[PDB]
Specification:
CATH class of the largest domain in chain A: Alpha Beta
Bound molecules: adenosine-5'-triphosphate, oxalate ion, magnesium ion, sodium ion
Organism (chains A, B, C): Oryctolagus cuniculus (Rabbit)
CATH architecture of the largest domain in chain A: Alpha-Beta Barrel
Modified residues (N6-succinyllysine) (chains A, B, C): 54, 154, 310, 486
GO cellular component, one term (chains A, B, C): nucleus
Number of helices of chain A: 19
Helix content of chain A: 25-40%
Oligomer: part of a larger assembly
Binding site for substrate (chains A, B, C): 61, 258, 283-284, 316
Distance between the termini of chain A: 27 Å
Strand order of the largest sheet of chain A: 1-2-3-12-13-14-15-16
Radius of gyration of chain A: 25 Å
GO molecular function (chains A, B, C): ATP binding; magnesium ion binding; mRNA binding; potassium ion binding; protein tyrosine kinase activity; pyruvate kinase activity
Largest interface: A-B, 72 and 73 residues
Strand content of chain A: 15-25%
Chain lengths: 519, 519, 519
């Protein structure tokens, strides 16, 4: 009984590949797919944060949607505190990224009967008037609804729908004025105060960044985050807007755009080009677009990013059930796996870690599935498809990347060691999707932490100073990776590994590739 | 914007195929995936049952693990009643299949406070006693739980873990008694009636066919079911025995082996060979085996049945969130869409329709996701991969099927019309997976009911009496199909369609293929 | 029992396909690739004609660059004589096409000693005078060499090179005047009559359609030729021009454009688009362009026509040897084979039949090699690729063809019988390259003759009156095929066949496909 789906790995067709999957075919210890965990009341503590890390947490996500700078900073604190607890063991030390998730643009209704707690009941088939007249900003009721978005009538059309409260309530536009909309309740319910609005199929003129947004980003810069997850991206311009706010001080910050609506989907191509990475924000996306289309968009986005060699994140409701239970649903297990099969660089946990009763279990779970799904990929076919995709480019690093992955397959390397500072070298490899783990040694901590954004990248921070001999310095770094994979159980002495390095100190890339034996 | 993902249909590569999936690409009216609904308390009603038919249900599932024969015979009548209510119009009548789900070698709980619909809430950390004392078999509660399995004590040990209800609840043995076990709730949860008990890693020697199984099966024959879903099939032998119990009288009833344990996976090959079809039974499966391995088994199984040309069903917890909510989760929408992509012939609903709060929704949602996933298939690679797999075969009807599918792809016909009595011809078409709808006109009722097990087959009962001239008869049936297609919105006058008929009466199969325009 | 490379037909890769070709794997009786024979002095005879047809000859080419209208008219005569000589038994009657090969924009020497059958030896180093002196026109010889081109002196420099007879002889201009050219013979060789002059890389302003061309054209129209090999076609305009001269009376004469220069190649596409088919005239072509590049043209050109669905011919020096030897060279046998594998619908013989010592042997040799090569094709992949190409198209007859061919493979049918009058349904099928024979039954003689242009089509001429009853009439025709197939030894009883017919009369195409057993 081969391991890691090697038997199916040898299939000629996709169909054969499937038919060959084996539950008895064990997968390697190394889990390539990054796990992004939203931190919160459930996970905030150091102790817990220690467990989250132990459990497989790679990225700590800061949902700026709620809480104060003072709160988040405290979370970041703890995170940093928890991470460092292992530093004492440079070998057993594991980098953990910090991400900032923007509240983003928002539409909100007014107060019901001047009360924040009151409710009304909209009944299907009834008429309801939307006004922009702040005269009613606190006089919302069964007949009149006031909202935050002054330009609404400009972007919505008669016959269009207005969704209130996470799509709970649906409204159909029957009449449009410059100051109001006359709608018809399709999907009734109780209406509370200050509920969210969604304008499915609308090309919303809200700014790329709210005022709050600007503030958080600056904050994130001051906090030294590793990336930013930018809510509500609808076009390249919006990405540019964010870039602009982070500016020169935060030019090294990774901007991940969140695809959450039709527009975003339709203008994905430009958005992708302008971004550093993508996040398939299923939550809103599923609210914005028909829930039955989400998958299409998910696979489209994943394929496109894989094609472009840009990091992609699958997020939202992956293990939903797990907020309350220690074991997920079958669909849940399915979802995580397909996600990984799709080509997703990272997978995410929101509610599950933030507030749920089983944060660690969610993490462990994700870890478990990802590993299995990872072996189950059809690498040969994939590499081949990818290569074709990129045929247009004759880049050297890529060539190095292609050659090295091909070799890792050929001799079934146990790992791929890449020495990089910027991490470009390592990114080039990950994109070609080896099956083996990519152990990347860098002296740049931020590069290290950011690596997580990429599939198969296992960052190892070199905390030593530079030697007078390049050669030696390189050898050392290599050895480091060697003690790690060993310490991690990725391999043992005798195993073979692909080693990538820069010929000289001003090489520019890992131009030197070598097949080597573990000590 | 092209329809039915036809742009992505032109993809050369799988990677490319994925990249071109467009949410703005609208599916067709026809939904190829059969929808199987478990009928129960929530769905038993004739009014309701009428609703579900309209919403899309193709097969009525009755679980003999719950209720009674009479409970079941009543439901069966209601389905039949509901169904025939449409028999009137020979163009809007939807054949609806009936299926019996066996108990098999399983361990089951008692009744909760004397009810088959009542439940109780367990509390993490609480103690719970399992009793064999038949005195409580109807008095199960939060303090005491009665089991089916009298030997339970010999096959368990202190510290052993007992799972209840597809792993929902985890009990850990604390105390062994001669008549009982004092357990501990390891996790909070709602305990319902007659729930499965799973003892992973325990010697449970139950027979493939129990005396009770004998009665249900015979009852199913008397009930004139169309197929049996055979729980916990473990070897071809089990299957043979079932066929044996159904004997001559129920020789035409379809046997669907349910895969839900290690053994069933392991001996899958021998199981498929002997069955009429398979079910991926995820509920039990995922608790028997590692939850993380499910998708593997799921995928292996579906490739295998696809390869084999035998009907496969994906089931359980597919729209799980919908038992309580009116919208499914993101993992849920994915699951369903991936099962279709995986190649499942039918998908299924359990608690969702049997006892949930939103039975019709659950249905329409499956329906929605299904048409979408359908269009998203990569038919060209698929077909190619299928052809290949059945290379060794040289069958005449296979030949007719492949040429039929092939040309349908080519001229993009609106459907394939197939004249069949055994349903053999149609099935052979469905295995080659065309995009278009297969409309199978038959005078044989069971065939028509039975057809739903096969992808894309929309069965049409020709009620007209056999014409004395082959030609007119054939023509007669074609018109019937032509009319249903038009009525059902499958196509319009001018559309092009592929027609499979016999040259002569008693030709044996559809050896006649023509491309015909709609009238 | 190995036959028709069926084992190789099952390879997954092009490599494995190769690796599996078995010499011991016997080919079927049916030779797919048409054999075109250049009818000359050596094959004019009725008695010789009889044996060649017998030998596998499907088409006769009458080269206008040689002879007089009268010599060619007799040849036709004899051709048709030896042909209908077989009209006795319509089961074994084999049609033969009559092809007019044009002069074109060419330079041609004159009569060697008023002969034309006369030859002359030229020694290396010797001297030869090119003259425009008509009084030598028919008096060429070792000393004196007359030519077609009165401007040649303007188009050539001293030191330059003059090619005679497809580059057979290299003449270097030593000195030139107004009237003549003074050259020294660069390589020895037999200089014959009405030879070809190639002034490679020289601005010849020849006209696309000589008045003589015109003359001949009109002549062949009266001759009732089925096709035309238009020599030296350089651009679509030339085609239209030939098309032009063919005018109405010959709106059905197939125009086969010959690519024998750098321009023809370069303007291939529009040429192709305008012409009914193409010939790869390597004799002239190989001297017009570097000898080392012809195979690139051949492959590009054969590939393109395949793609287009237009008949292509491989022509010139295939079995050169054989003009003097009874057995061809290794290189020549590879050539015919490779040409067949390339995709050529037809193959040609030139000197081999027209003047060679072993006309009959050469023919049979083509027959022999073709068969063997037809089997060696990788039908699987080829069909997929062919479809990849035709993918934009949704033509109905095309869908028929494809499904038909697809079926043919599946059930290893012994043949496909097509009933056609225009012949298109048959070409449509031919183009999809089935391994099996196409028995194309028609009541159109010209159709039957022209069918030889397309690969695998075996033309059968139905001589019987029309049936009042379509069915009978169709049947009959089908019967015809059956008998002929039987008589030809294509199949026996119980063999499977694919039947292509039209549902009704004037169906515009075969819309009805049926799988049948031989009677
Ligand atoms: N006929 C019925 N009467 C009462 N409750 C039912 C009935 N059918 C289903 N249910 C309820 O719905 C739940 C899920 O239905 P399902 O048919 O999938 O049962 P199950 O317990 O999961 O076992 P299986 O493994 O056999 O499917 C059952 O556990 C039971 O609580
Ligand atoms: N009608 C003919 N009469 C006599 N000899 C002929 C005749 N046709 C062909 N031949 C001889 O056969 C040789 C090869 O025949 P072919 O038809 O290929 O002519 P060619 O000169 O090579 O012209 P092309 O380029 O057109 O093929 C001719 O060059 C000629 O010597
Ligand atoms: O913002 C998100 O993550 C979402 O909507 O899923
Ligand atoms: O029995 C079933 O359907 C299951 O367990 O999924
Ligand atoms: O005419 C030809 O065949 C040639 O020139 O090769
Ligand atoms: Mg969001
Ligand atoms: Mg169940
Ligand atoms: Mg079960
Ligand atoms: Mg020529
Ligand atoms: Mg020649
Ligand atoms: Na956020
Ligand atoms: Na059951
Ligand atoms: Na010529």
């Amino acid at each position: 009984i081969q391991t890691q789906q090697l038997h199916a790995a040898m299939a000629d067709t996709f169909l054969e590949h499937m038919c060959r999957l084996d539950i008895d075919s064990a997968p390697i210890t190394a889990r390539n797919t990054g796990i992004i965990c939203t931190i919160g009341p459930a996970s905030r503590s150091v102790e817990t944060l220690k467990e989250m890390i132990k459990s497989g947490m790679n990225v700590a996500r800061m949902n700026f949607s709620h809480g104060t700078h003072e709160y988040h900073a405290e979370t970041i604190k703890n995170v940093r505190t928890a991470t460092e607890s292992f530093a004492s063991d440079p070998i057993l030390y594991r980098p953990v990224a910090v991400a900032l998730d923007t509240k983003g643009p928002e539409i909100r209704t007014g107060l019901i009967k001047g009360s924040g707690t009151a409710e009304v009941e909209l009944k299907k088939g009834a008429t309801l008037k939307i006004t922009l007249d702040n005269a009613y900003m606190e006089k919302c009721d069964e007949n009149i609804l006031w909202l935050d978005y002054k330009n609404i009538c400009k972007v919505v059309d008669v016959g269009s729908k207005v969704y209130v409260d996470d799509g709970l309530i649906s409204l159909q536009v029957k009449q449009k004025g410059p100051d109001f909309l006359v709608t018809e309740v399709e999907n009734g319910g109780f209406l509370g105060s200050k509920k969210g609005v969604n304008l499915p199929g609308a090309a919303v003129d809200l700014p790329a960044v709210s005022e709050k947004d600007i503030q958080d980003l600056k904050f994130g810069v001051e906090q030294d985050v590793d990336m930013v997850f930018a809510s509500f991206i609808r076009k390249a311009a919006d990405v540019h807007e964010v870039r602009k706010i982070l500016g020169e001080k935060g030019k090294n910050i990774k901007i991940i755009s969140k695809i959450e609506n039709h527009e975003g989907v339709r203008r994905f191509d430009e958005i992708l080009e302008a971004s550093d990475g993508i996040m398939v924000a299923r939550g809103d996306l599923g609210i914005e677009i028909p829930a039955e289309k989400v998958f299409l968009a998910q696979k489209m986005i994943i394929g496109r990013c894989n094609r472009a060699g840009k990091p992609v994140i699958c997020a939202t409701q992956m293990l939903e059930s797990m907020i309350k239970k220690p074991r997920p649903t079958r669909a849940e297990g399915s979802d995580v796996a397909n996600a990984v099969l799709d080509g997703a660089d990272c997978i995410m946990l929101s509610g599950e870690t933030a507030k749920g009763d089983y944060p660690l279990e969610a993490v462990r779970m994700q870890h478990l599935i990802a590993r299995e799904a990872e072996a189950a990929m059809f690498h040969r076919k994939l590499f081949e498809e990818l290569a074709r995709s990129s045929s247009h480019s004759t880049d050297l690093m890529e060539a190095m990347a292609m050659g090295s992955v091909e070799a890792s397959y050929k001799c079934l390397a146990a790992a791929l060691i890449v020495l990089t500072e910027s991490g470009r070298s390592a990114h080039q490899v990950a994109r070609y999707r080896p099956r083996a783990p990519i152990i990347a040694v860098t002296r740049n901590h931020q590069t290290a932490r950011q690596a997580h954004l990429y599939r198969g990248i296992f960052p190892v921070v070199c905390k030593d100073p530079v030697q007078e001999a390049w050669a030696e310095d390189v050898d050392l770094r290599v050895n480091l990776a060697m003690n790690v994979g060993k310490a991690r159980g990725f391999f043992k002495k005798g195993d073979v590994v692909i080693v990538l390095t820069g010929w000289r100190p001003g090489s520019g890339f890992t131009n030197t590739m070598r097949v080597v034996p573990v000590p």
